[PDB]
């Protein structure tokens, strides 16, 4: 639309909240592939932060590419490497969700503030495969990664 | 006259050929089929088949197991599970496996385990005998 | 021109079988080779930001890419190869780069020098 | 009645073991091709 | 619909067509390989069946134990491959139970299990999955026969249903009888065979069971790959027709939207 | 007019919901299996 | 369009004739899902009439949902309940077609009137599955359902 | 607030795996989702008192209707309402006045539903 | 679109240069099948010209259809009355190419201005099968058919 289209050029950072992601229950519904920042360069944030961000974006785009095939084959017929990409992509998709201190009324959960180093560590580990055994739902609406581990432990105990 | 048919699951060696003689090893002692042999049906044992072509030619194939069926009308079906020509086999490795199997024979956890182990010894001994 | 004609032809071949890229296996050897070469070439065309490259550097890199000298390297390692190889040639071999630059073409002796340089650097990369 | 039938086996198991013994004694290169066209991938679902 | 609805639908159908074309190519390659591997297995299995059709064995008409084996795969998108096999299996099972028999079923492939999990859900002796991921080998048939014999359902008669591969475009569903040594021993045609006690004959029956299962596996996989190639080709053709229609609709809608916006601008300009 | 990746689930037609379900069922199954394994490891590592 | 869209709010019963259905050969081409009415209320028409109408609409809507997949993947990638739904929905679609007397000249058939009880009974029977052994083209352009059965018998000959 | 929350979670999970129709867990998830779905249907000009809605939704969401067929859920809903509105008017009055499902109210609801389900 | 929808009302013919044919080295890269003409009518261009053109179009369509079979099932699957059509269609494709007088610095040959009778006779002969024994490359980038004969003699001897 002309109004948002024109507004795009006046902003350094943008976070394009998406309805297609809010339907899935991932909140905030920020679209990881449709959001950008000016400072998002390796010389401003660092090479670790930048590489983690680009790895996350690439894995999500590959997941989008695969979703077209899964609509015909099915998950059971994917290359045993592709299922790994899909699992990592779903874990990363859930791990971006976070409970706010102002959305207590809706979710009923408790707000979490995640320091930047903890987010970088969490996503670097999720990509590196150090969590390819925990189920997806363990990562849904939690703060740092250790909280996901604890939630998975609780899920297993009351299994 | 014979109608030999010697086929592995993967490859087929003879298909409705007409050979002179077929020396085959079966569970109840080896024997050799000719034009008008008496009908039988035996089950092989790890040994080596020797086929004589219609002329004086002779060819050896090491069969691991299978079934030989000499039919009423001089038609032999010899289906091996894994028939390999002798040139494809390794002499030293067969000795090595024979010795190893002789080793594990002692740790006979149960008569079934001993049976499988010393079936392995039987097959490897047949291999070394064929290759020696 | 010399290197880019082949690069463009190979990329065009790769773009019409890129759909199979997911399957890849369970396909003839020609399609496997097309996919492999195309992936190597695309990983080659990747570039940093605010890091342009002289024409001699570009032609050396693309020449290494399009003659098969990267069909052994894994695609994830092509972006590191490109970098290390480029630094190598830029430091050790300036006479060849200067020859290509000023001359404008790849002379047969320069082609042989590029062949030996690419093989020697790729001979041990790890 | 062979020994392995006295131990409760079946000729399918005997043929399996003999085929293994013949397959792990090929010239090295052939072993690769023997890995194909051999070895199960089927699974059994208990009912 | 509106222009965005049509655009999204058109993009989705284009992706679907691309995917089905790729899958047709993959299935065609796997089919070529399957035919190549089917020729020798064809001769081998026909030989293994030689005996029974040469020494005509009539199943006894006084036994109640029957076995039905139905060979298929796990993969879908193969058209009426699993459907035909399951239909014939339930036909034969109904006939046997109407004749007063005690039928069981072995399902080589999920889709067979699924089609028959509503009715005949209790007759499953055992079923096998992981079929179709890789070309079947003699190892698979040996495992199926081994788990059939180990599971102590000593059957008195048998049948196997598979899709015999006729041609790249056609296949037929067969029913190959399987006998238990109780029927071979007491057959007068078998009185001619020499050096035959009831132990060598038992090993022979076990081996022939493995042989017939392997033959059925090879025929079934060839026919299934052919059918998947055909199904993907037809699906791609249908997606192409739908893409043509939707492209026509999209062009009409795009022109209509341009005209509508322009007329709005003109009316506003002239209404000052 | 072109096509882009991840468009089948952008339309949200029948194929989109079909794909979403084909994914969700599979990953619920795998999550159940992984949770069972996690419980087993928990119990086996108490001592 | 503004004109029909505005007229919709001035009517008790609507009957949206559709060109696709007319292209399938069905006549009248009434779209069973766009057509509505104010008196389609269990307190006015009954409970068998209302239940039958809602069952027909539900099965037709399920068939409409399946149509997109059926068109590309083919009718082989369907569960057995879905194949049953497709068969029943096609039988119902054909059965809603009727030969009018004003179209005697057009097609040479004989015009048919179908009292309400016969309509409800026939659709009850189709819905319950009493006629799953008939061919779907046995319902095309008939009066009451017994005429569909007679047509199916004639087809066997 | 107590009951509709669990119902909301159950329908949210159900809507994900709904487009098809194996394992016990997901099969029961679909069963519960469908039971709740047929629970939410309603007629015209017959609004329900809030306590009655709570009773029906509680019965549906506490795994009670999972045994019944999904085509009979309307019959249950209706008969259960008619039974409670007369025999257990006191419990509905309690729920309305106190405005919550107390522990004693929950135990009652439990026994009423358990008795009625079998008796139907 | 109104622009081409309005211009196409006036066109009396059509030529379709295709990138997919300049790749093959055929020149001029005119799409033989997508090209159209209003006067391709036996009443205008005569019966013999019309029949030759229709035969060439039919054989080219047949080869196009067969190419799918070649790509999927491999060349072996063809019959002997289809491998022959493949060969004839390849020869026709080669013969449809021509060297231009204004392109002697691109093809190393000398441009040819083939009259009409020469073209019709050449394609009629190729369709009849009179040249099935020659190599395909003997038809590439030549003038009349006699040039194809001379090229075959010069390259085989």
- How far is residue I49's CA from residue I51's CA, in Å, rounded to a whole number? 6
Give the number of other CB atoms < 10 A from CB of residue A31.
Answer: 18
Burial of B113 (0-12, 13-18, 19+ CB in 10 A): middle
Q: What is the DSSP letter of B89?
A: B
CA distance A66 to chain C (A): 9
Give the number of other CB atoms < 10 A from CB of residue G14.
Answer: 15
Q: Does the distance separating the beta carbons of F22 and A64 come in below 8 Å?
A: no
Q: Rg of chain B over CA atoms, in angstroms?
A: 16
| Token pair recorded at residue A13 | 């950072």
- How far is residue G124's CA from residue H21's CA, in Å, rounded to a whole number? 25
Give the number of other CB atoms < 10 A from CB of residue D47.
Answer: 14
Alpha carbon separation from C18 to C14, C23, E12, H88 (Å, rounded): 6, 10, 18, 69
Bridge partners of E124? E105
- How far is residue B12's CA from residue E42's CA, in Å, rounded to a whole number? 10
Q: What is the DSSP letter of I49?
A: H
Q: Does the distance separating the beta carbons of A41 and C22 come in below 8 Å?
A: no
Q: What's the CA angle centered on A39, arms A33 and A41, to 5 degrees?
A: 75
Bridge partners of H75? none
Chain I hits for E25, CB-CB cut-off 8 Å, are: 72
Do H46 and H78 form a contact (C-beta atoms < 8 A)?
A: no
Give the number of other CB atoms < 10 A from CB of residue C14.
Answer: 19
CA distance E196 to chain B (A): 7
Do C109 and C96 form a contact (C-beta atoms < 8 A)?
A: no
Question: DSSP string of E192-254?
Answer: G-BS--TTHHHHHHHHHHHHHHHHHHHHHHHHHHHHHHHHHHHHHHHHHHHHHHHHHHHHHHH
Q: Does the distance separating the beta carbons of A71 and F31 come in below 8 Å?
A: no
List CB contacts of I81: < 8 A, sequence separation 6 or more.
none
Helix-helix angle C94-103:C75-92, to 10 degrees = 90
Chains H and C touch (3+ CB pairs under 8 A): no
Give me the half-sphere count of Cα atoms (radius 13 Å) on the Cβ side of residue B103.
6
- How far is residue G98's CA from residue G112's CA, in Å, rounded to a whole number? 7
- How far is residue H38's CA from residue H72's CA, in Å, rounded to a whole number? 9
Do E60 and E79 form a contact (C-beta atoms < 8 A)?
A: no
Question: DSSP string of A92-132?
Answer: HHHHT----SS-HHHH--------HHHHHHHHHHHHHTTTT
CA distance H13 to chain F (A): 10
E strand map for D1-47? 43-45
Chain A hits for F37, CB-CB cut-off 8 Å, are: 133
Main-chain dihedrals φ then ψ at residue A117, nearest 5 degrees: -60, -35
Q: Rg of chain H over CA atoms, in angstroms?
A: 15
Angstrom resolution of this structure: 4.0
E strand map for H1-120? none
- How far is residue H105's CA from residue I155's CA, in Å, rounded to a whole number? 103
Do F15 and G77 form a contact (C-beta atoms < 8 A)?
A: no
Question: DSSP string of A36-70?
Answer: B-SS-STTTT-HHHHHHHHHHHHHHHHHHHHHHHH
User: What is the domain partition of chain B in residue ranges?
Assistant: 1-89, 90-132
Burial of F18 (0-12, 13-18, 19+ CB in 10 A): buried
Alpha carbon separation from E208 to A21, D38, E48, E139, I144 (Å, rounded): 58, 18, 6, 14, 68
Q: Does the distance separating the beta carbons of C49 and A82 come in below 8 Å?
A: no
Chains E and B touch (3+ CB pairs under 8 A): yes
- How far is residue E56's CA from residue E260's CA, in Å, rounded to a whole number? 82
Alpha carbon separation from B53 to B2, B79, B111 (Å, rounded): 11, 18, 43
- How far is residue E198's CA from residue E179's CA, in Å, rounded to a whole number? 14
- How far is residue G148's CA from residue G146's CA, in Å, rounded to a whole number? 5
Checking phi first, is residue I129 left (phi over 0); if not, alpha (psi -120 to 50) or beta? Answer: left
List CB contacts of D43: < 8 A, sequence separation 6 or more.
E128, E129, E130
Size of interface E-I (CB pairs under 8 A): 11
Do I142 and I148 form a contact (C-beta atoms < 8 A)?
A: yes
Do E206 and E200 form a contact (C-beta atoms < 8 A)?
A: no
Buried b / exposed e across E105-131, counting CB within 10 Å, b at 16+?
bbbbbbbbbbbbeeebeebbbbbbbbb
Instruction: Provide the sign of the torsion angle of the four alpha carbons C52, C57, C59, C62, taken in this order.
Output: negative
Chains F and H touch (3+ CB pairs under 8 A): yes
How far, in whole angstroms, is CA I134 from its chain's centroid? 16
| Locus of tokens 């995917």 | E19
- How far is residue A65's CA from residue A86's CA, in Å, rounded to a whole number? 10
- How far is residue B126's CA from residue E263's CA, in Å, rounded to a whole number? 94
Q: Does the distance separating the beta carbons of D10 and E150 come in below 8 Å?
A: yes
Measure CB to CB from residue G72 to each of E76, E79, E239 and give the nearest one: E239
Q: How many residues does chain F have?
A: 47
Q: Does the distance separating the beta carbons of I74 and E229 come in below 8 Å?
A: no
- How far is residue A135's CA from residue A130's CA, in Å, rounded to a whole number? 13
Measure CB to CB from residue E18 to each of C19, C26, C28 and give the nearest one: C19
Chain A hits for C74, CB-CB cut-off 8 Å, are: none
| Token pair recorded at residue I93 | 């494709």
- How far is residue G138's CA from residue G153's CA, in Å, rounded to a whole number? 9
Alpha carbon separation from F30 to A60, A88, B75, F34 (Å, rounded): 20, 13, 54, 6
Report the candidate in C83, D4, E193, E212 with the shortest Cα–Cα distance to residue B37: E193
Strand E102-108 versus strand E124-129 pairing type: parallel
User: What is the domain partition of chain E in residue ranges?
Assistant: 1-25+232-272, 26-231
Q: What's the CA angle centered on E216, arms E213 and E218, to 5 degrees?
A: 110
Q: What's the CA angle centered on D18, arms D12 and D20, to 5 degrees?
A: 105
Chain E hits for G76, CB-CB cut-off 8 Å, are: 79-80, 83, 231
Question: DSSP string of E104-136?
Answer: EEEEESHHHHHHTSSSSSS-EEEEEE--SSS--
- Residue numbers in the known binding site of H are 42, 44
CA distance G51 to chain F (A): 27
Q: Is E232 on the interface with G (CB under 8 A)?
A: no
Do E220 and E162 form a contact (C-beta atoms < 8 A)?
A: yes
Alpha carbon separation from C117 to C41, C54, C122, G108 (Å, rounded): 19, 18, 8, 89
Q: What is the DSSP letter of I23?
A: T
Chain E hits for I73, CB-CB cut-off 8 Å, are: 28, 32, 168
Mutate to test the interface with E, among B41, B42, B65 (most CBs of E within 10 A): B41
- Residue numbers in the known binding site of C are 47, 49
Main-chain dihedrals φ then ψ at residue A83, nearest 5 degrees: -55, -35
Question: DSSP string of chain G?
Answer: -HHHHHHGGG-SSB--B-HHHHHTT-SS-B-TTT-B-S--STTTT-SHHHHHHHHHHHHHHHHHHHHHHHHHT-TTSS-HHHHHHHHHHHHHHHHT----STTHHHH--------HHHHHHHHHHHHHTTTTTS-GGGSTT-SSHHHHHHHHHHHH-
- How far is residue A131's CA from residue A146's CA, in Å, rounded to a whole number? 11
Q: Is E59 helix (H, G, I), strand (E, B) or coil?
A: coil
- Residue numbers in the known binding site of C for ATP are 47, 49
Do I93 and I26 form a contact (C-beta atoms < 8 A)?
A: yes
A 56-115 residues inside an 8 A Cβ radius of C: 65-66, 69, 79, 82
């Amino acid at each position: 639309d002309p109004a948002p289209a024109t507004t795009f050029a006046h902003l350094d950072a943008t976070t394009v909240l998406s309805r297609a992601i809010a339907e899935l229950g991932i909140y905030p519904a920020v679209d990881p592939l449709d959001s950008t920042s000016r400072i998002m360069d390796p010389n401003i944030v660092g090479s670790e932060h930048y590489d983690v961000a680009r790895g996350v974006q690439k894995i999500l785009q590959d997941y989008k590419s695969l979703q077209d095939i899964i609509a015909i084959l099915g998950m059971d017929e994917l290359s045993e490497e592709d299922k790994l990409t899909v699992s990592r992509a779903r874990k990363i998709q859930r791990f971006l969700s976070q409970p706010f201190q102002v959305a207590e009324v809706f979710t009923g959960h408790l707000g979490k503030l995640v320091p930047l180093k903890e987010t970088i560590k969490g996503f670097q580990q999720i990509l590196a495969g150090e969590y390819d055994h925990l189920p997806e739902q363990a990562f849904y609406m939690v703060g740092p990664i250790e909280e996901a581990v604890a939630k998975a432990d609780k899920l297993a105990e009351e299994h | 006259q014979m109608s030999f048919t010697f086929a592995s699951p993967t490859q087929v060696f003879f298909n409705s050929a007409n050979v002179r003689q077929v020396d085959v090893p079966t569970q109840t002692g080896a024997f050799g089929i000719l034009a008008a042999h008496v009908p039988t049906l035996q089950v092989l044992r790890p040994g080596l088949v020797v086929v004589h072509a219609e002329d004086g030619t002779t060819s050896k194939y090491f069969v691991s197991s299978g079934s030989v069926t000499v039919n009423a009308d001089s038609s032999v079906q010899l289906l091996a599970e894994e028939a390999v020509t002798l040139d494809m086999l390794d002499l030293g490795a067969a000795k090595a496996n024979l010795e190893k199997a002789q080793s594990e024979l002692l740790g006979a956890a149960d008569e079934a385990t001993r049976a499988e182990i010393q079936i392995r010894i039987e097959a490897n001994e047949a291999l070394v005998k064929a290759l020696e | 021109k010399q290197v880019a004609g082949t690069m463009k032809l190979e990329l065009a071949q790769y773009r019409e079988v890129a759909a199979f890229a997911q399957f890849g296996s369970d396909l003839d050897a020609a399609t496997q080779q097309l996919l492999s070469r195309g992936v190597r070439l695309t990983e080659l065309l990747k570039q940093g930001q605010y890091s342009p490259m002289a024409i001699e550097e570009q032609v050396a890199v693309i020449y290494a890419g399009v003659r098969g000298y990267l069909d052994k390297l894994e695609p994830s390692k092509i972006t590191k190869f490109e970098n290390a190889f480029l630094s190598h040639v830029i430091s050790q071999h300036q006479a060849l780069l200067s020859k290509i630059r000023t001359d404008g073409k790849i002379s047969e002796e320069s082609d042989a020098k590029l062949k030996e340089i690419v093989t020697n650097f790729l001979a041990g990369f790890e | 009645v062979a020994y392995w039938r006295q131990a409760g086996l079946s000729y399918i198991r005997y043929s399996q073991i003999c085929a293994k013994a013949v397959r792990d004694a090929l010239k090295t290169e052939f072993k690769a091709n023997a890995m194909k066209t051999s070895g199960s991938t089927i699974k059994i679902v208990k009912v | 619909a509106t222009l965005k609805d049509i655009t999204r639908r058109l993009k989705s159908i284009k992706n679907i067509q691309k995917i089905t074309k790729s899958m047709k190519m993959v299935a065609a390659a796997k089919y070529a390989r399957a035919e190549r591997e089917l020729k020798p297995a064809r001769v081998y299995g026909v030989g293994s069946l030689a005996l029974y059709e040469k020494a005509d064995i009539k199943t006894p008409e006084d036994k109640k134990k029957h076995l039905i084996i139905g060979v298929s795969s796990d993969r879908g998108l193969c058209g009426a491959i699993h459907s035909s096999v399951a239909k014939q299996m339930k036909s034969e099972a109904a006939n046997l139970a109407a004749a007063g028999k005690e039928v069981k079923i072995i399902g080589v492939g999920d889709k067979i299990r699924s089609i028959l999990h509503r009715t005949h859900s209790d007759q499953f002796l055992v079923t096998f999955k992981e079929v179709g991921r890789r070309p079947p080998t003699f190892g698979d048939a040996s495992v199926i026969a081994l788990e059939l014999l180990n599971s102590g359902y000593e059957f008195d008669e048998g049948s196997i249903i598979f899709n015999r591969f006729r041609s790249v475009i056609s296949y037929k569903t067969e029913e190959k009888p399987i006998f238990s040594l109780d029927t071979i021993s007491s057959a007068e045609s078998m009185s001619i065979y020499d050096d035959i006690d009831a132990d060598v004959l038992r090993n022979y029956q076990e081996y022939s069971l493995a042989n017939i299962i392997y033959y059925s596996l090879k025929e079934s996989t060839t026919s299934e790959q052919s059918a998947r190639m055909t199904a993907m080709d037809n699906a791609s053709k249908n997606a192409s027709e739908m893409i043509d229609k939707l492209t026509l609709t999209f062009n009409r809608t795009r022109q209509a939207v341009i005209t509508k916006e322009l007329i709005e601008i003109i009316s506003g300009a002239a209404a000052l | 007019v072109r096509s882009s990746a991840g468009a089948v689930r952008d339309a949200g037609g029948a194929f989109g919901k079909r794909e979403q379900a084909e994914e969700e069922r599979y990953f619920r199954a795998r999550a159940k299996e992984q949770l069972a394994a996690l419980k087993k490891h928990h119990e086996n590592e108490i001592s």
